[PDB]
Amino acid sequence: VQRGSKVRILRPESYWFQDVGTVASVDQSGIKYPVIVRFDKVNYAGINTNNFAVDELIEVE
Amino acid sequence: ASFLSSIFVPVIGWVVPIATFSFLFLYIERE
C-alpha cells in the first residue's frame, strides 16, 4: 500500500495471523511477496518483519 | 501326573528361547 499503512494478515501459517501490522516498504517487480510489514510484536524467532503478497493484506486505514 | 512340570517348564525356560532366539538372530541377519 504505502509506507505507514496498518494492514492485517490472512496467511494461516504465519505467526501474526489476524494481527495488525505496518507496511515499511513495497517493492515493484519481484518477489511475488513484495510487501515488507514491520510488525510490533515478535514471533518465536525474535524477528518482527516479514514479506507478504499484495492480495494477502487487509488495509484498515 | 505332576511330573509333566519337570519336562514342560525347563523346555519353556531353556529350549523355547534358545530355539526362538537362534531362529530370529539368523533371520534378522539374512541378506
Partner: protein, 739 residues
C-alpha cells in the same frame, strides 16, 4: 541391505540397530506397511481379529485346566468362607526348603499360589460343582479356540476372502451384532441360568445328561405361551435359603425381589435371570432398526444428511450439522478405534463401580482380597482404554482426517473454537488444584499445630442427598424413597414397586458396600479425582486438537504422529508432537487411578476391620494418608522375608522391591536423553576394535543409542510396569495378610 523387516524397505536398508527396534513397534501397524492397499488392509485386520480372539479362549481354558488339575475347587465347595483358593502350583528349582514349607498351603501337597482373581466364586455361582466340569469346559475351549484359528485362515483364501464393500456395510453389522451378539447371547445366558445355574443353586443337579428330561419349572412352559407369566414369579427362594441346598428353596425362575441373598450377600439368581431375559428383548428389538437388503428400516446416512424437521428447514439433527459424519466414522479405522475404546473405557470402569457395591457372586463379599483385586484390575484397564481413545482419536486427525469432506459439520466446529476448549479446561484444572491442595495443606498445618478443630471440613451435602434420595435413613433427609409418603416411593398410579422392599433392606444395612456412608474425608478426594480427570483430559484433548498444527509449528500433519521435535530453533520444540501428548497423559492417568484406588482401598480397610473412625478422622489431612495407610499397612508386607525366616508373603515382598526398581529404572530414559549416550557408545566402539583378542568378532549392526521417541516408549514402559507391580504387591499382601 537385509530383507528384514519385510514390511518396509526404508527400515531394511538401515545399517544400525535402529533396524531391529523399529521393526517391533511398526509390525502390527498395518497401515504403514509397504504397498498396503485399502481392501488388503481390512482383510488382514479381520483375520488378525480371529488371532486375538483365539488367544482369549486359550487364556480362559488355562484358568479352567490349572484349577481342575492343581487347585482345590471340590474342597472349596464345602466351605467357601474359610477354605483359601488355589490358582496353580509352583515348580521352582531355585527354592530352598523353608520356601517350600512356606508355600505348601491351603491343604495341598506342594507349593501352590493362592488365587486372588475370584474365579472360584464365578464358577460356583453359575453351577459348576466338581473338577470334571472344569476339565470339560477346558477341553471345549481348546476346540472352540481352534474353531477361530481355522476361521482366520479360511477367510484369507482368495475366493473366501471378503470384498471391500462387505466391511463398509455398517447398517448390517448393527443389526446382526445388536440382535445376535448382544441379544441372543443375553438370551442364551438367561437360558443357562434358568435351566442349569438356578437349579444347581437349590441342591438339584442338572447336567448335560438330564437337562432334556428335567424342566426348570413344574409348570413347564405352559404359562409362557398362554400369557400367565406370573406363574414364573411364584414362591421364591426364602430368607433361610442355604445356598446349593434344598433348605428354603423355591420353584420360581424369574423373580424381582431386588437386593441381596441373605447368606451369600450376592444378587439373587432369579433376579439375574429376569435381567438378562429383559436385556435380550430390548436388544433383539433394537437390532431390527437399521436398513439392510430387505428394504425396511432406518438409514444412518440419511439420518445424518437430513435437513428438514417436519417441513421446518434445519441444519441437521438437533439443528446441528451432522452431515459427512457417516463418511467419517465408516471410512476411517482410527476414528472407529478411537471411538470404541472410549465406549469400552467407560463401561470398564462402570463394571468396577458396580461390582463392589452390588456383588453378584456367591460368597465374594466375604473373601476380601479377591474383591480388592477385581476393583483395582478393571480400573487400570479402564485407564488405558481411555488414554488410547484419545490417542487413536488423534491419529485420526493427523492421518485420516479430511477437512473438505468434513466441512461445516459439528466436527469442523470443534476445531474452530479449540482455543476456548483448552482455556476452560486449563481453568478447571487450576481452579481445583489451587483449592484442593490448599485445603489439604491447611488441614496438615492445623493438625500439626495441635489445634485440629481449625480444619476446613465440608460435608458432601450434594451426595448426601442422592444416597437419601435412594433410600438411606441414616442421614435423615427424608426424600424420594426414604420419604414413605413420596410419589416416587409409592409409584402412585400403579403401586408396582416390587423391587423396593428388597432394595431398602440392602441399602439400610451397615454390612455391605452398597452406598457407603460418606463424610468430609470423602469430599476432598472426589474433588481430587475431578482434578485428575479434567487434567488428563486437558493433555489428551489439546494433543488431539493441536495435532494438525499451531503457531509454534504449523503443518505437523506432514511429519506424522510420532516425531521427536523440530530442532532447537524457535526456542526449541522438545515434546511437540501429538504422540508426545499421549505420552505426558499416562503419567496423570496412572496418577489419578492411584488416587481412586488408594481411596477405595483405605475406606474398605476400615469397613473390613470394623474401624470406620480411623478413615473419617485421618483422611482429611495428608499425613493420615501417609501414616495410617502407606506406613502402617506395609508392615506385614516388608516382613515377608527377614533374617529370622520367610512366610507365604515373600513373593509379594520381593515383587514390591522389584516394582520400586523397574519404576526407578525408567527415570534414566527420561531425565537423561540421547546425545549423552551416543557419545558414550562411540568410546565402546573404539575400545572393541583395539582389544586384541576380542576383535576377532564384530557386529553386523552398528551400535547406536536409542532414538528420541524410542526411549520415551522404553522410559514409559519401565515406569508403568513398575507402577503396576508395586501397588499390586501392596494391595494383595496388605489385605491377604490381615483378612
Amino acid at each position: 541391505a537385509t530383507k528384514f523387516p519385510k514390511f518396509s524397505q526404508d527400515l531394511a536398508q538401515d545399517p544400525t540397530t535402529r533396524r531391529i527396534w523399529y521393526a517391533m513397534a511398526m509390525g502390527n501397524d498395518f497401515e504403514s506397511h509397504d504397498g498396503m492397499t485399502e481392501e488388503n488392509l481390512y482383510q488382514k485386520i479381520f483375520a488378525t481379529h480371529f488371532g486375538h480372539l483365539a488367544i482369549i479362549f486359550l487364556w480362559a481354558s488355562s484358568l479352567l485346566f490349572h484349577v481342575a488339575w492343581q487347585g482345590n475347587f471340590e474342597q472349596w465347595i464345602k466351605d467357601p468362607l474359610h477354605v483359601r483358593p488355589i490358582a496353580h502350583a509352583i515348580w521352582d528349582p531355585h527354592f530352598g526348603k523353608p520356601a517350600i514349607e512356606a508355600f505348601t498351603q491351603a491343604g495341598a501337597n506342594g507349593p501352590v499360589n493362592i488365587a486372588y482373581s475370584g474365579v472360584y466364586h464365578w464358577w460356583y455361582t453359575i453351577g459348576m460343582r466338581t473338577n470334571t466340569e472344569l476339565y470339560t469346559g477346558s477341553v471345549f475351549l481348546l476346540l472352540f479356540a481352534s474353531l477361530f484359528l481355522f476361521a482366520g485362515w479360511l477367510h484369507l483364501q482368495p475366493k473366501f476372502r471378503p470384498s471391500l464393500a462387505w466391511f463398509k456395510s455398517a447398517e448390517s453389522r448393527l443389526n446382526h451384532h445388536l440382535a445376535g451378539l448382544f441379544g441372543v447371547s443375553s438370551l442364551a445366558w438367561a437360558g443357562h441360568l434358568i435351566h442349569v445355574a438356578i437349579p444347581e443353586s437349590r441342591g438339584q443337579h442338572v447336567g448335560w445328561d438330564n437337562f432334556l428330561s428335567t424342566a426348570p419349572h413344574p409348570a413347564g412352559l405352559q404359562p409362557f405361551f398362554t400369557g400367565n407369566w406370573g406363574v414364573y414369579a411364584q414362591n421364591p427362594d426364602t430368607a433361610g435359603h442355604i445356598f446349593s441346598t434344598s433348605q428354603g428353596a423355591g420353584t420360581a425362575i424369574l423373580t424381582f425381589l431386588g437386593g441381596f441373598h441373605p447368606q451369600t450377600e450376592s444378587l439373587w439368581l432369579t433376579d439375574m435371570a429376569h435381567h438378562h431375559l429383559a436385556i435380550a428383548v430390548l436388544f433383539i428389538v433394537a437390532g431390527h432398526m437399521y436398513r439392510t437388503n430387505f428394504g425396511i428400516g432406518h438409514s444412518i446416512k440419511e439420518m445424518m444428511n437430513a435437513k428438514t424437521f417436519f417441513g421446518k428447514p434445519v441444519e441437521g439433527p438437533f439443528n446441528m450439522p451432522h452431515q459427512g459424519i457417516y463418511d467419517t466414522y465408516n471410512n476411517s479405522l482410527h476414528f472407529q478405534l478411537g471411538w470404541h475404546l472410549a465406549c469400552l473405557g467407560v463401561v470398564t470402569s462402570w463394571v468396577a463401580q458396580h461390582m463392589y457395591s452390588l456383588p453378584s457372586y456367591a460368597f465374594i463379599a466375604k473373601d476380601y482380597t479377591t474383591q480388592a483385586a477385581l476393583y483395582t484390575h478393571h480400573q487400570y484397564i479402564a485407564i488405558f482404554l481411555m488414554v488410547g481413545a484419545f490417542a487413536h482419536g488423534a491419529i485420526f486427525l493427523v492421518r485420516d482426517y479430511d477437512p473438505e469432506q468434513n466441512k461445516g459439520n459439528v466436527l469442523e466446529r470443534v476445531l474452530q473454537h479449540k482455543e476456548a476448549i483448552i482455556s476452560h479446561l486449563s481453568w478447571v484444572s487450576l481452579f481445583l488444584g489451587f483449592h484442593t491442595l490448599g485445603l489439604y495443606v491447611h488441614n496438615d498445618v492445623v493438625v500439626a499445630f495441635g489445634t485440629p478443630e481449625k480444619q476446613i471440613l465440608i460435608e458432601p451435602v450434594f451426595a448426601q442427598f442422592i444416597q437419601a434420595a435412594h433410600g438411606k435413613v441414616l442421614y435423615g433427609l427424608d426424600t424420594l424413597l426414604s420419604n414413605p409418603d413420596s410419589v416416587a416411593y409409592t409409584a402412585y398410579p400403579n403401586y408396582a414397586n416390587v423391587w423396593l422392599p428388597g432394595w431398602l433392606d440392602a441399602i439400610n444395612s451397615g454390612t455391605n458396600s452398597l452406598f457407603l456412608t460418606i463424610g468430609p474425608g470423602d469430599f476432598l478426594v472426589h474433588h481430587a479425582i475431578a482434578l485428575g480427570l479434567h487434567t488428563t483430559t486437558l493433555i489428551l484433548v489439546k494433543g488431539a486438537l493441536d495435532a494438525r498444527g499451531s503457531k509454534l509449528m504449523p503443518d505437523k500433519k506432514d511429519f506424522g504422529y510420532a516425531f521427536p521435535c523440530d530442532g532447537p530453533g524457535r526456542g526449541g520444540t522438545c515434546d511437540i508432537s501429538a504422540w508426545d501428548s499421549f505420552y505426558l497423559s499416562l503419567f496423570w492417568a496412572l496418577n489419578t487411578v492411584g488416587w481412586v484406588t488408594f481411596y477405595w482401598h483405605w475406606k474398605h480397610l476400615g469397613i473390613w476391620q470394623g474401624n470406620v473412625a480411623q478413615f473419617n478422622e485421618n483422611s482429611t489431612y495428608l499425613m493420615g494418608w501417609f501414616r495410617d495407610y502407606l506406613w502402617a499397612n506395609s508392615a506385614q508386607l516388608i516382613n515377608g522375608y527377614n533374617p529370622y525366616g520367610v512366610n507365604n508373603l515373600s513373593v509379594w515382598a520381593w515383587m514390591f522391591l522389584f516394582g520400586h526398581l523397574v519404576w526407578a529404572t525408567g527415570f534414566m530414559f527420561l531425565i537423561s536423553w540421547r546425545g549423552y549416550w551416543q557419545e558414550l557408545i562411540e568410546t565402546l566402539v573404539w575400545a572393541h576394535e583395539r582389544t586384541p583378542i576380542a576383535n576377532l568378532v564384530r557386529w553386523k549392526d552398528k551400535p547406536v543409542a536409542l532414538s528420541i521417541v524410542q526411549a520415551r516408549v522404553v522410559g514409559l514402559a519401565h515406569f508403568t510396569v513398575g507402577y503396576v507391580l508395586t501397588y499390586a504387591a501392596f494391595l494383595i499382601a496388605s489385605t491377604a495378610g490381615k483378612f
